[PDB]
């Protein structure tokens, strides 16, 4: 009944603005604009945002505010047959924790690494470098940059691992950074939301300040406007290519994060009559806007690299960790006051992921507290038991070969697993429960029903938008590979028996409860499709 509520309304919004904005807004969206014809890419990205992303973002936020419970209890109360959807989502988020925080450490390692007059990653005459060290990025594989060799040879020591079977030594300089991450996560989430919803004031906001002072520093560099050209010069040739709508579709889904039980969790502590539809629209737009901004911060410095440093644009217009740990640092090492751009750049990368780890873990804590009161009372104890396990098994990721184990989790822990789980979320809510019954819920909350646009996006466009991604995610499938390393067969099977370790609980729990209640066969479905609110 009388469960907690955000001490302030901004605490909620920043917790959502923060969960949604992470490194993928920096090291993935600007690249897609660059690859897919500049401004023209905003067409499919907006269309996929407006019909796939915002519909699913609004939906889970509503369910969270309305049913007032974490992800397990809530799906168990909409369609009890499909209660397993909640169980699956908590697992998928549990898995992602085993590799997502390790990239926050990388950001702190380079932070504790930028306390120097001469940043270490700029020169090719260190002990870790090779005879094939260029000062900047190239397009020949055997000859890496002074910052690709700093990252892959001093920070990581990935060179001393023959593959996933060879983990080798624990880098305790990194294992210390991982503990600093889970310490920050513990003392932000342990005493509940009253404290959490305050830390997001720094972690959700600090990036906007660094983005601003790096935007000025980026746009005032010789050649910055040439980067913006590479970033946004429209080329509508690509809008006619199918493999572009999939990049839009896939960026839209994995950047807003609907269906992972976090907006559900966060909204469950809203007041019942909060204008969550306005909270969806506001929060969403702020995500996509934060990527558009970041893309100037990148391609300004990318053009300056291409004009005053002699590097092909193709060779620095990268995505993923390489762009923020190798390319962009190596551009900072040239500009004056480099030490300052580093320290704020890495402190930005760190605070960008902490927001998101909070919500991923808060979805877990909430979902179980609302179902296992044995742990709802015992909270401070519980999270210590979660993070310690995360840390302990996370020592595996602080090895010389750790990265191989991470790329693996990166592909299977929340891959097609979350796509198919969210597919049964759209179907459960729109079809089994009922769009009409859902709108009547929404009316009672904010006072009006969802427009027909929203209701058509919920029973038709959403499951097809998802299906659209999931099918093409299987069309262009390949076996798992990093550089010349090809992961063994048993690594992939290990990965599948991780993606399935969550989806299977959808039909398993649907099979368990179906065989746990008395009655006739149809008589069972009807009892396992009647919501908890209708039975009283």
């Amino acid at each position, epitope marked *: 009944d009388e469960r907690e509520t955000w001490s302030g309304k901004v605490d909620f919004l920043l917790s959502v603005i923060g969960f949604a904005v992470d490194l993928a807004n920096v090291w993935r969206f600007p690249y897609l604009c660059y690859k897919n014809g500049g401004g023209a890419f905003l067409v499919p990205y907006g269309i996929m945002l407006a019909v796939g992303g915002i519909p699913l973002f609004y939906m889970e936020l509503a369910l969270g505010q309305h049913n007032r419970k974490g992800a397990i209890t809530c799906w168990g109360r909409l369609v009890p047959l499909f209660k397993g959807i909640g169980y699956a989502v908590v697992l998928i988020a549990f898995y992602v924790g085993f590799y997502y925080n390790v990239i926050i450490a990388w950001s702190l390692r380079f932070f504790f690494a930028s306390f120097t007059n001469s940043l270490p990653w700029t020169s090719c005459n260190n002990i870790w470098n090779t005879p094939n060290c260029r000062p900047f990025e190239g397009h020949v594989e055997g000859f890496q940059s002074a910052a690709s060799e700093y990252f892959n040879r001093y920070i990581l020591e990935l060179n001393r691992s023959e593959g996933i079977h060879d983990l080798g030594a624990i880098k305790w300089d990194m294992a210390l950074c991982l503990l600093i991450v889970y310490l920050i996560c513990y003392f932000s989430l342990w005493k509940g939301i009253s404290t959490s919803g305050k830390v997001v004031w720094f972690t959700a906001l600090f990036p906007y300040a660094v983005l601003l002072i790096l935007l000025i520093r980026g746009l005032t560099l010789p050649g910055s406007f040439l980067g913006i050209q590479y970033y946004l010069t429209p080329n509508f040739s690509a809008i006619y290519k199918a493999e572009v709508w999939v990049d839009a579709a896939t960026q839209v889904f994995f950047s807003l994060g609907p269906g992972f039980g976090v907006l559900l969790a966060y909204a469950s502590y809203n007041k019942y009559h909060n204008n969550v539809y306005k909270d969806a629209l506001l929060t969403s737009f702020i995500n996509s806007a934060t990527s558009f901004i970041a893309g100037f911060v990148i391609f300004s410095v990318l053009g300056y690299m291409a004009h005053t440093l002699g590097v092909r644009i193709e060779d620095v217009a990268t995505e993923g960790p390489g762009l923020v740990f190798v390319v962009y640092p190596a551009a900072i090492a040239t500009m004056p006051a480099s030490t300052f751009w580093a320290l704020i750049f890495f402190m930005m990368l760190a605070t960008l992921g902490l927001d998101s780890s909070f919500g991923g873990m808060e979805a877990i804590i909430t979902a179980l507290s609302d179902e296992f009161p044995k742990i709802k009372r015992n909270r401070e104890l519980f999270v210590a038991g979660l993070f310690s396990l995360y840390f302990v098994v996370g020592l595996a990721s602080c090895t010389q070969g750790g990265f191989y184990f991470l790329h693996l989790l990166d592909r299977y822990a929340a891959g097609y697993s979350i796509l198919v789980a969210v597919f049964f979320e759209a179907i459960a809510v729109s079809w089994i429960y009922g769009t009409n019954r859902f709108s*009547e819920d929404i009316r009672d909350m904010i006072g*009006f*029903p969802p427009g027909r646009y929203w209701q058509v996006c919920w029973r038709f466009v959403a499951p097809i938008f998802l299906l659209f991604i999931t099918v093409y995610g299987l069309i262009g499938y390949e076996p798992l590979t990093y550089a010349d390393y090809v992961y063994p067969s048993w690594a992939n099977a290990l990965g599948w028996c991780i993606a399935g370790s969550s989806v299977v609980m959808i039909p398993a729990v649907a099979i368990f409860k179906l065989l746990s209640t008395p009655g006739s066969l149809r008589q069972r479905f009807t009892i396992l499709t009647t919501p908890w609110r209708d039975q009283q």
Partner: antibody
Amino acid sequence: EVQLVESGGGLVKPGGSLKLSCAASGFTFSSYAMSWVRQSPEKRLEWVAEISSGGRYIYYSDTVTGRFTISRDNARNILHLEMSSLRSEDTAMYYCARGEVRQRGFDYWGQGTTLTVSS
Amino acid sequence: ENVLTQSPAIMSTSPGEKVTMTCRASSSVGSSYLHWYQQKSGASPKLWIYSTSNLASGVPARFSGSGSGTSYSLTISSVEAEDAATYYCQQFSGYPLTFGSGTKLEMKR
């Protein structure tokens, strides 16, 4: 084209019980929540009970709660109001109003049916 | 119960003149939740103004709404004889739902 016509109702003795009816036509009744508003002979409007578009959310007034019951029939487009334990204070014309959007008020009102509660 | 009080209770007015009438809540009301109904003698009420200032369908442009918080006002730029009615404000923001006490508009002669 949308039209509400209320029905039933007349003279009851105190403690009696009556059931009023509102016949919706000209729109998709099931998509809109409805509410009973009454008007005393002193010409004072008073809200009585709201019923959500699917009847799962139902708000009464403190002056009729425990005595009055509101219900829907989206199959035949009828809105009912079962009154028990009637009192002379319940004497009014009873109106049937259509209000699905709280930010828009009651967009369509019926025509009234009269209840006298006298011995 | 959010008691709404309308003032004046009765005002007479010559056609062409400008008339203002006030609605006063005992508890603040969000401006998107305060509406106005007209009721003519022997007939049912009609929705006239919703969300403080938005005119309902068929309402001539000589009517306006203003106000916010606990004080709101209906205003008729130049009155006509077909406006002689009783005006009720309504609050839709909390339960129980409450109607004002009425303003009666009569024609001066």
